[PDB]
Amino acid sequence: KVPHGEVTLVGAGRLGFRTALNLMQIHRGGPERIKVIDGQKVSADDLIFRLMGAKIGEYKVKFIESLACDGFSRTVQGIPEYITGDNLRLIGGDVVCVEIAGGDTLPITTEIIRYAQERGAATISTMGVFGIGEEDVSVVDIDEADPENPIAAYLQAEGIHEHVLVGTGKLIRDWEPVTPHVLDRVSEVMTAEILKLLRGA
Amino acid sequence: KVPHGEVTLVGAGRLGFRTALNLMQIHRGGPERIKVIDGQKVSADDLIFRLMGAKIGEYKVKFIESLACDGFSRTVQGIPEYITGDNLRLIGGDVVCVEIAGGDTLPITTEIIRYAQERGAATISTMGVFGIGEEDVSVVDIDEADPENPIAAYLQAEGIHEHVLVGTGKLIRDWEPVTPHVLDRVSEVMTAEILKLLRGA
Ligand SMILES: Nc1ncnc2c1ncn2[C@@H]1O[C@H](COP(=O)(O)OP(=O)(O)OP(=O)(O)O)[C@@H](O)[C@H]1O
Ligand SMILES: Nc1ncnc2c1ncn2[C@@H]1O[C@H](COP(=O)(O)OP(=O)(O)OP(=O)(O)O)[C@@H](O)[C@H]1O
């Protein structure tokens, strides 16, 4: 049982970086290729990166690529760009996981899931990653998801189907911030659901 | 002798596909990573690509990366974008080779060299690749290049130094078309010159 299969991670911030580390450490299986796409640099406030050795001002993705040194047997590719309506061709592979934050992310998330499912990729993304540590992380297909969750509401109005959602279901409006423990939990679950989708391919 | 270092080929058409194929069949050394960057899709006119099994409509770079299957012990990365003054970030690693054609290529060529050399990459590009078959292929540093050549002239005007040019010297003003043999011979010397730059690093 060797690696096979390509996972693209659009978004490699505090969450996506955890997802990348988890996928990169997989043995007896998991993906052969990991593509990570994010336009942002490591800042002072990115302690989880700096604690692992990233320098302030280094592209996120380039740090993550750097961990797959000469000899590493999976392929890790980082592309230091934001996904826009204009570079969807950066998206294919076998599974596409969207873990982006900042601004309004729903129209791009929708454009990413269409394009990828068009090309035959299974899709997964988050539905709220707020929490103080003591929240459950749940997983639901889009057509069972809570229609009061703004993320599910938006994706269901965009007529998205066969799309996995992970997270705590707490969002920016309500009071809880984002703690590292909640992100570790959501990352673990996300990794497990990516591997299920990878098997389905 | 083992694979080490990264080469970036900006442009992967008739000529840059040939230098890719060369670098990807190196053994007992050569680069560890080959990064191929080109915005263009394979067309019916691209026979070299078609005869090697590419489908019309495929990005040139996805094709190239596809040849590097599971098991391949160097890493090949295809980024299906044109370099512009906005995404120079894609430019990095140990050698960057510019083999682009099609419209306004001397500004973007200048910007790539300066941006690459500032991040410490060694740089190489073409100086005319027209010819009917046996014309000499010469190699020359920018500061030794003949200022009758419009490419040399442009780069010298822009104060480019420590920059290797390779080609036949024949340009649009010459009566010659571009033939597949002249490309093979320019690709072969390009490959040799990249390997020199890679060792010196
Ligand atoms: N269009 C997009 N394409 C690629 N990446 C994007 C896009 N929009 C945002 N991002 C990336 O998503 C990442 C969000 O990471 P960030 O650390 O800010 O939040 P997070 O991982 O959700 O964790 P937290 O829950 O702590 O905010 C950033 O690195 C950002 O660059
Ligand atoms: N700004 C750019 N960045 C990346 N690639 C580019 C850029 N501009 C042009 N190119 C690429 O340069 C390649 C040139 O390929 P093309 O087959 O047309 O000419 P060639 O390699 O010089 O061969 P010939 O000498 O027969 O014309 C194209 O695939 C094109 O997409």
DSSP state of B30: S
Q: Which residues contact A110 (CB under 8 A, 6 or more apart)?
A: A154, A155, A158, A160
Give the pocket of ligand 1 (CB within 6 Å).
Answer: A 10-16, 37-40, 60, 82-83, 100-102, 105, 108, 129, 178
Instruction: Dig out the tokens for B32 from the structure.
Output: 């560890």
Residues of A in contact with B32 (CB under 8 A): 70
Mind spelling out the 3-state secondary structure of B87-154?
CHHHCCCCEEEECCCCCCHHHHHHHHHHHHHHCCCEEEEECCCCECCCCCCEEEEHHHCCCCCHHHHH
Number of other residues whose CB lies within 10 A of the CB of residue B30? 22
Strands of A57-169, DSSP E: 75-79, 95-98, 122-126, 138-141, 163-167
Q: Is B167 in the pocket of ligand 2 (CB under 6 A)?
A: no
Among protein residues, the one whose CA lies closest to atom 8 of ligand 2: B100
Mind spelling out the 3-state secondary structure of B49-74?
HHHCCCCCCCEHHHHHHHHCCCCCCC
Of B32, B62, B87, the CB nearest to A70: B32
3-state secondary structure at position B37: strand
3-state secondary structure at position B18: helix
Percent of residues in chain A assigned helix, strand, coil, to nearest 5 = 35, 20, 45
A138-146 contacts: CB < 8 A, separation 24 or more? A138/A166, A138/A167, A138/A168, A138/A169, A139/A164, A139/A165, A139/A166, A139/A189, A139/A193, A140/A164, A140/A165, A141/A165
Task: Identify which of A29, A14, A124, A9 has the alpha carbon closest to the alpha carbon of residue A76.
Answer: A9
A184-190 contacts: CB < 8 A, separation 24 or more? A184/A18, A185/A137, A186/A15, A186/A126, A186/A129, A186/A137, A187/A15, A187/A18, A187/A19, A187/A22, A188/A22, A189/A137, A189/A139, A190/A19, A190/A97, A190/A99, A190/A124, A190/A126, A190/A166
Torsion region of B62: left, alpha or beta (phi above 0 gives left; psi -120 to 50 gives alpha)? alpha
CA distance B169 to chain A (A): 35
3-state secondary structure at position A108: helix
User: What sign results for the dihedral spanned by CA atoms B146, B152, B154, B157?
Assistant: negative
Cα angle: B177, vertex B183, B188; to 5 degrees: 155
Q: To test the ligand 2 pocket, which listed residue (B9, B14, B62, B176) has its Cβ within 8 A of the most ligand atoms?
A: B14
B73-112 residues labelled b (16+ CB within 10 A) or e (exposed): ebbbbbbbbebeeebbbbbbbbbbbbbbeeeebbebbbbb
Helices vs strands, H then E, count in chain B = 6, 7
- Alpha-carbon gap, residue A107 to A151, rounded angstroms: 10
Measured in whole angstroms, the distance separating CA A100 from the mean position of its chain's CA atoms is 7
Q: Given an 8 Å threshold on Cβ–Cβ distance, is A75 in contact with B75?
A: yes
Instruction: Dig out the tokens for B41 from the structure.
Output: 């899709």
- Alpha-carbon gap, residue B71 to B30, rounded angstroms: 17
DSSP state of B21: H
Ligand 2 centroid – CA B78 distance (Å): 15
Q: Given an 8 Å threshold on Cβ–Cβ distance, is B90 in contact with A80?
A: yes
- Alpha-carbon gap, residue A53 to A136, rounded angstroms: 31
Q: Given an 8 Å threshold on Cβ–Cβ distance, is B87 in contact with A70?
A: no
Q: Residue B11 CA: which ligand 2 atom is closest?
A: 5
A152 half-sphere exposure, CB direction, 13 A CA radius:
22
Q: How many residues does chain A have?
A: 201
3-state secondary structure at position A138: strand
Ligand 1 centroid – CA A106 distance (Å): 13
Alpha-carbon separation of residue A104 from A107, A151, A172, B184 (angstroms)? 7, 11, 11, 49
Q: What is the largest CA-CA distance in chain B?
A: 48
Q: Which residue has the tokens 């190489």?
A: B124
What residues does each domain of chain A span?
1-201
Ligand 2 centroid – CA B103 distance (Å): 9
Q: Is A70 on the interface with B (CB under 8 A)?
A: yes
B51, B22 in Cβ contact below 8 A?
no
User: What sign results for the dihedral spanned by CA atoms B145, B147, B150, B156?
Assistant: positive
Q: Is B129 in the pocket of ligand 2 (CB under 6 A)?
A: yes
Residues of A in contact with B3 (CB under 8 A): 70
Q: To test the ligand 1 pocket, which listed residue (A82, A88, A98, A100) has its Cβ within 8 A of the most ligand atoms?
A: A100
Q: Which residue has the tokens 């060299």?
A: B113
Report the first-to-last Cα separation within chain A, whole angstroms: 16
Interface test with B, best of A70, A73, A88 (most B CBs within 10 A): A70
- Alpha-carbon gap, residue B102 to B97, rounded angstroms: 16
Parallel, antiparallel, or unpaired: how do β-strands A6-10 and B95-98 relate?
unpaired
- Alpha-carbon gap, residue A141 to A115, rounded angstroms: 18
- Alpha-carbon gap, residue B110 to A155, rounded angstroms: 44
A200 half-sphere exposure, CB direction, 13 A CA radius:
16
Among protein residues, the one whose CA lies closest to atom 2 of ligand 2: B82
